[PDB]
Design a protein around this ligand. Structure first.
Ligand SMILES: O=C(C1CCCCC1)N1CCC(NO)CC1
Lengths: 237, 300
């Protein structure tokens, strides 16, 4: 069934699973036309498909050409997401295919179930967790590859960098969700925290800076403060 | 006009014959039902006064045999049987009528209700849904599950309705996933109509039979089947014009006949609101929408 706080450690067991987040698939800028009407202009998007145990991120870049001449784009985007996840599963060897796919938004359940009818044994599940994966496009290197794409493209990343050499996947997921929640709440502040110290750099093959263990504890505290800061600014508390 | 003789009525029972019903008291001098219209299927159904649990009954067509009801004290129910000796049967019935021991099928001459509820229902198709080939009539009761229900347990006692499942490989062509799920015309017209049912008459016949089993026996799987066959049509953007007009008439008379007090348990709010107000056919069922809005506006 649904995934929530009671069965949270299930994410880090040895049954292959993927999160799918579709919040950045269909992206637009809204602008005024010469006549003073409003129109949208699509910009490139991405499907965020993540193995929470290994950190493997299958970033399917959605090029604006896939919307050309199509109607009801917000509905189509869920079906396009399901089409691409199904294609990904079919592309993997049997022993790498997921046993469960957890969608972050309930509107993806029927599109994905229908595209996955050939895989009756893969469970398609919702979640009651409010995960901050929409903020994936606040990670500079992910935003860069999406915006530069001139055609459909899949790019593979490890969203945990090398963290799993030192911490468990439970702890790595917790760090990732804290970072993404901060970036979603106040992107400028969060990026200043992450990059204010020019001596700590991002390796070419990484997404995040090369913090020591002690530095991660400081960074993590600074992100909690920021989230509490914005919460008080927001609610006047 | 045909007759169904009752050997006797040893236990108090409410007896249904089509949309009519009457009470028989324990050991009352009741010998059956006469003046049954030829040309239609019929259903004779039962609810015991001492255990309203298990409504049960028999679908039959008097053109297919001479049928009578006899209570079985071992199995504890009224059983339909066939009398093969036609002279013995005519003799028995004539005696019962002369002594006026029979209720008369009470058809008002203006009234087409039963025809309108069974227009496309044929005994031969009932006997394929309800498998018991040694009898010419078909037993149904409140508890019988459907073949689809048994997938999700005795197969001999199941209702073999045609399985409809909107999230199934049968319903969804590879590469038309979104199209076929949002517009079910392929599944309706090619898979179901051309492929399984062969024509719309057979589809409507199963739809009408499912409704009648839901209404007369409170058979839950029949209610599920009835709503699925409605929803498949309403969720198809391409439906022959004559099918939509006929569906509107079929549903109108079903809604008209439904007991007002059973609406809460025989009508699926989601399906009807979708069908009347969101679906492709939301503007095609004028008679049904009008009777629904005036009879069951709560449900909507
Ligand atoms: O009702 C009767 C009896 C007839 C003789 C007097 C007592 C009742 N039948 C007996 C079983 C039938 N057989 O065709 C038909 C029903």
């Amino acid at each position: 069934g649904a995934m929530n706080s009671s069965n949270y450690a299930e994410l880090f067991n040895n049954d292959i699973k993927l999160f799918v987040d579709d919040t950045n698939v269909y992206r637009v800028t809204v602008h005024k036309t010469f006549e003073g009407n409003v129109a949208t202009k699509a910009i490139n998007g991405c499907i965020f498909t993540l193995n929470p145990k290994t950190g493997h991120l299958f970033l399917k870049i959605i090029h604006t050409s896939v919307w050309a001449g199509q109607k009801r784009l917000s509905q189509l985007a869920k079906w396009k997401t399901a089409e691409e996840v199904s294609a990904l599963v079919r592309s993997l060897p049997k022993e790498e295919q997921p046993k469960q796919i957890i969608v972050t938004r309930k509107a993806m359940l029927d599109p994905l179930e229908v595209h996955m009818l050939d895989f009756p044994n893969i469970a398609i599940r919702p979640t009651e967790l409010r995960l901050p994966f929409s903020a994936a496009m606040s990670i500079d290197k992910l935003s860069d590859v999406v915006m530069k794409a001139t055609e459909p493209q899949m790019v593979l990343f490890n969203i945990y960098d090398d963290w799993l050499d030192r911490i468990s996947s439970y702890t790595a997921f917790s760090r990732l969700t804290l970072l993404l929640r901060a970036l979603k709440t106040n992107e400028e502040s969060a990026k200043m925290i992450l990059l204010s110290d020019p001596t700590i750099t991002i390796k070419s093959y990484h997404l995040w800076p090369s913090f020591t263990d002690e530095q991660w504890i400081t960074i993590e505290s600074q992100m909690r403060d920021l989230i509490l800061t914005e919460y008080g600014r927001k609610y006047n508390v | 006009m045909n007759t169904v003789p009752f050997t006797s009525a040893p236990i108090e029972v409410t007896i249904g014959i089509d949309q009519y019903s009457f009470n028989v008291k324990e050991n009352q001098p009741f010998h059956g039902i006469k003046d049954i219209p030829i040309g239609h299927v019929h259903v004779i159904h039962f609810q015991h006064a001492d255990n309203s649990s298990m409504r049960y009954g028999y679908w039959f067509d008097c053109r297919m045999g001479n049928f009578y009801i006899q209570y079985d004290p071992k199995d504890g129910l009224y059983k339909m049987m066939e009398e093969r000796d036609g002279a013995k049967f005519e003799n028995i019935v004539h005696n019962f009528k002369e002594r006026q021991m029979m209720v008369s099928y009470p058809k008002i001459d203006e009234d087409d209700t039963w025809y309108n509820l069974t227009e496309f229902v044929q005994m031969d198709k009932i006997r394929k849904i309800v498998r018991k080939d040694e009898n010419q009539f078909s037993y149904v009761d409140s508890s019988m599950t459907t073949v689809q229900e048994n997938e999700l347990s005795d197969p001999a006692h199941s209702l073999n309705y045609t399985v409809i499942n909107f999230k199934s490989r049968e319903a969804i062509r590879p590469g038309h996933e979104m199209e076929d799920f949002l517009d079910k015309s392929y599944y309706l017209n090619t898979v179901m109509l051309q492929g399984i049912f062969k024509n719309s008459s057979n589809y409507f016949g199963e739809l009408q039979f499912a409704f009648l089993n839901a209404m007369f026996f409170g058979n839950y799987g029949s209610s599920l089947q009835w709503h699925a066959m409605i929803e498949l049509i309403c969720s198809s953007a391409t439906v022959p014009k004559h099918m939509l007009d006929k569906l509107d008439e079929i549903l109108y008379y079903q809604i008209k006949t439904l007991p007002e007090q059973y609406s809460d348990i025989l009508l699926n709010e989601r399906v009807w609101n979708i069908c009347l107000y969101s679906s492709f056919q939301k503007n095609s069922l004028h008679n049904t929408e009008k009777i629904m809005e005036n009879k069951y506006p709560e449900l909507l």
